């Protein structure tokens, strides 16, 4: 058959619900997780199941498992749901900053290397998007760090201008630019 | 207590399975977040009697594995990724 | 091409065998030179879905292994050495 | 049964001889090695066997193997020697030196930490032996490095004197000392 998805929030302890839907009000349902294998059960307090909502459980309890699935045994037969894949994801970007931060004076022929750095929570993925006037790009403690490097090898005088770097967590975005003036070789 | 003939055998420079972060092998995919975040690959490993020697692959291959890449609060898709595995290892100088 | 259910299983945080230099575990024995210079030990390994989590032993043990320690151009004697092995692993916070 | 030993010299390419002794002049003998398994054969040139000397082979050919053993098959039966354990060992010490190298003036109550460092070839084992006037010791690129650290926590004025460090490869030894003067707390 198929598989499903269940998203773990940036905030564990918050409850997640697996859409294991039923039809028998009193259905005694469990939830297996992997890997490694564990099985959970409602406790009335935090863990539950609802014919029309499904298995509800604190995301911190299954955050580790790549997959989970409801299960129930009635009569001589046990059946269980489709595999629900756990997706643990974050979206916060603390700050975007590049080096050099301040002003920049250069001259024709020189090389330039600008470093953009993302400071995010954990479980974060970052997409790097730049903005500027033959240019090469490359992408690579309770925090996560990301960095992109732009290089121009033999700058012309028309590389003078604003250089904005943008980092995206997927729902949050942050910029931080610098101006780059260029002149002719001195004397 | 494991004997020496045991130990010696168990240490031989051969293809051992090892855990690697996908992030290490595929670092260019920053936007993506993988499930599982690490995979097991056969790589040369173990030691050589002479510490002037070194355990090194003599026959690599590429393998393909299925990984769930979720993209920052956007989408999620099964991704086939290629990894390097070591088929033969050997004790060579440095 | 290894499927995802395969991959996922193969990556689970569990006791994996790994190669360790004896020099790393027993660094106080400088005068000695061991054969083999490395040994295989079961240690926690693999990954957790949440990268706020961490793969850690919940049940270690000590094991004894036979090693030939030769001493700088002097003597050579079989040496029984104690190592730490991981019997149970688990995904825990940081 | 038992096992034997065969020592690999500091100098590979030099030939080593495994005491697999015979009685049949024309005995066709081989040599298996582990690990991993390999089997060698005389080639008349470099590799040979002698009823009264045994298997001779360039140490660089088997340096990797933890063990080796002669072997021969006559009639319906093959027999082979006892396990000979390979021992790869070095003995050269390049230089012995400590930090600080120069003179040392201190005062009572102060702590002192002296670092001794051995620079040797490879496959070398080192034994550290000191010499000096409540003192703690601790032991731990085509070269090998070793280091010992001596610490006195609250030096008295009678810790003044010469401090010699000696490193031993097992057949070679090298010293390198420094004088440590101590005075009373200034003013």
What is the dihedral angle through the alpha carbons of D97, D99, D102, D106, rounded to the nearest 10 degrees?
A: -140
Interface partners of A (3+ CB pairs, < 8 Å)?
Answer: B, C
Are C47 and B36 contacting, i.e. CB atoms less than 8 angstroms apart?
yes
- Residues in chain B within 8 Å Cβ distance of D12: 52
Longest dimension (CA), chain B: 55
Contact B39 C10 (CB under 8 A): yes
Interface partners of B (3+ CB pairs, < 8 Å)?
Answer: A, C, D
Nearest to B73 among A66, A146, A170 (CB): A170
- Residues in chain A within 8 Å Cβ distance of B33: 88-89, 123-125
The torsion angles phi and psi of A47, rounded to 5 degrees, stand at -105, 130
Radius of gyration for chain D, computed over Cα atoms and rounded to the nearest angstrom: 26
Q: Name the β-bridge partners of A179.
A: A162
Are D60 and B53 contacting, i.e. CB atoms less than 8 angstroms apart?
no
- The residue length of chain C stands at 94
Q: B1-94, what's its fold?
A: 2.10.90
Residues D5 and D18 in one domain: yes
Residues A36 and A99 in one domain: no
User: How far is the C-alpha of A61 from the C-alpha of C48, rounded, in Å?
Assistant: 13
Contact C11 A35 (CB under 8 A): yes
Residues A73 and A154 in one domain: no
User: How far is the C-alpha of A28 from the C-alpha of A33, rounded, in Å?
Assistant: 17
Q: How many domains does one find in chain D?
A: 2
- Residues in chain C within 8 Å Cβ distance of D87: 35, 68, 70, 76
Q: Is D47 left (phi over 0), alpha (psi -120 to 50) or beta?
A: beta
Structure letter (DSSP) for residue A82: P
- Residues in chain C within 8 Å Cβ distance of B18: 16, 18
Contact B11 C80 (CB under 8 A): no
Contact C13 A66 (CB under 8 A): no
Choose the final residue of a domain: D37, D69, D91: D91
Choose the final residue of a domain: A68, A91, A114: A91
Residues A59 and A113 in one domain: no
Contact C40 B1 (CB under 8 A): no
Residues D101 and D184 in one domain: yes
Element (H, E) at A55: strand A55-58
Structure-token pair, residue D89:
């060992």
CB pairs under 8 A between A and B: 55
User: How far is the C-alpha of B54 from the C-alpha of A11, rounded, in Å?
Assistant: 47
Q: What is the domain extent for residue D30?
A: 1-91
Nearest to B72 among A85, A125, A140 (CB): A125
CATH number, domain at A48?
2.60.40.10
Q: Cβ of C7 under 8 Å from any chain B Cβ?
A: yes
Structure-token pair, residue D17:
């001889």
Residues A115 and A163 in one domain: yes
3-state secondary structure A1-20: CCEEEEEECCCCCCEEEECC
Sorted by sequence, the CB contacts under 8 Å of residue A27 that are 6+ apart come out as: A49, A51, A72, A74
- Residues in chain B within 8 Å Cβ distance of D8: 50
Q: Cβ of B68 under 8 Å from any chain C Cβ?
A: yes
Residue of D nearest to B49 (CA): D64
The CA-CA-CA angle for residues C32, C37, C38, to 5°, reads 135
Give resolution in angstroms: 3.2
Residues D1 and D59 in one domain: yes
Count other Cβ atoms within 10 Å, centred on residue D77: 7
Contact D125 C71 (CB under 8 A): yes
Residues A16 and A49 in one domain: yes
DSSP structure string for chain D: --EEEEEEPSSTTSEEEE----S-TT--EEEEEETTTEEE---SSS-B--TTT-EEEEGGGTTT-SEEEEEEEETTEEEE-PEEEEEE-B--EEEEEEES-S-EEEETT--EEEEEEEEE-SSB--EEEEE----EEEE----EEEEEEEEESS--GGG-EEEEEEEE-SS-EEEEEEEEEEE----
Are D90 and D126 contacting, i.e. CB atoms less than 8 angstroms apart?
no
The torsion angles phi and psi of A158, rounded to 5 degrees, stand at -95, 15
Boundaries of every domain in chain C: 1-94
Contact C72 D168 (CB under 8 A): yes
Longest dimension (CA), chain D: 93
Among A8, A3, A1, A15, residue whose Cα is nearest residue A84: A3
Structure-token pair, residue B71:
């993209």
Among A9, A7, A176, A178, residue whose Cα is nearest residue A92: A9
Question: C-alpha distances in angstroms, D68 versus A85, D7, D32, D59?
Answer: 53, 11, 6, 11
User: How far is the C-alpha of A148 from the C-alpha of B30, rounded, in Å?
Assistant: 10
Interface partners of C (3+ CB pairs, < 8 Å)?
Answer: A, B, D
Residues D103 and D51 in one domain: no
Interface partners of D (3+ CB pairs, < 8 Å)?
Answer: B, C
- Residues in chain A within 8 Å Cβ distance of B28: 138-140
Q: Hey, of B31, B34, B38, B69, which one would you mutate to test binding to chain A, going by the most A CBs within 10 A of its CB?
A: B31
Nearest to D123 among B9, B12, B50 (CB): B50
Residues A84 and A96 in one domain: no
Residues A108 and A164 in one domain: yes
Q: Hey, of B5, B49, B56, which one would you mutate to test binding to chain D, going by the most D CBs within 10 A of its CB?
A: B49
Residues D7 and D80 in one domain: yes
Contact D87 C35 (CB under 8 A): yes
């Amino acid at each position: 058959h198929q598989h499903g998805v269940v998203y773990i929030t940036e905030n564990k302890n918050k409850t997640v619900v697996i859409p294991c839907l039923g039809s028998i009000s009193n259905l005694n349902v469990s939830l297996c997780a992997r890997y490694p294998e564990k099985r959970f059960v409602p406790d009335g307090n935090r863990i539950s199941w609802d014919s029309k909502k499904g298995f509800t459980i604190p995301s911190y309890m299954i955050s580790y498992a790549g997959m989970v699935f409801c299960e129930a045994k009635i009569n001589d037969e046990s059946y269980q749901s489709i595999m629900y894949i756990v997706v643990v994801v974050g979206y916060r970007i603390y700050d975007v900053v590049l080096s050099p931060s301040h002003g920049i004076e250069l001259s024709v022929g020189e090389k330039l290397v600008l470093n953009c750095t993302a400071r995010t929570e954990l479980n974060v993925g970052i997409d790097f998007n730049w903005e500027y006037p033959h240019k090469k790009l490359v992408n690579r403690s309770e925090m996560k760090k990301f960095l992109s490097t732009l290089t121009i090898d033999g700058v012309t005088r028309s590389d003078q201008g604003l250089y904005t770097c943008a980092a995206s967590s997927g729902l949050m975005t942050k910029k931080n630019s610098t101006f780059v003036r260029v002149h002719e070789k001195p004397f | 207590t494991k004997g020496w003939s045991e130990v010696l055998k168990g240490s031989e420079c051969k293809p051992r399975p090892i855990v690697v972060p996908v992030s290490e092998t595929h670092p260019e995919l920053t936007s993506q977040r993988f499930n599982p975040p690490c995979v097991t690959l056969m790589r040369c490993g173990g030691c050589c009697n002479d510490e002037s020697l070194e355990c090194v692959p003599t026959e690599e291959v590429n393998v393909t594995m299925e990984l769930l890449g979720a993209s920052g609060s956007g989408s999620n898709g099964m991704q086939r990724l290629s990894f390097v595995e070591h088929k033969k290892c050997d004790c060579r100088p440095r």
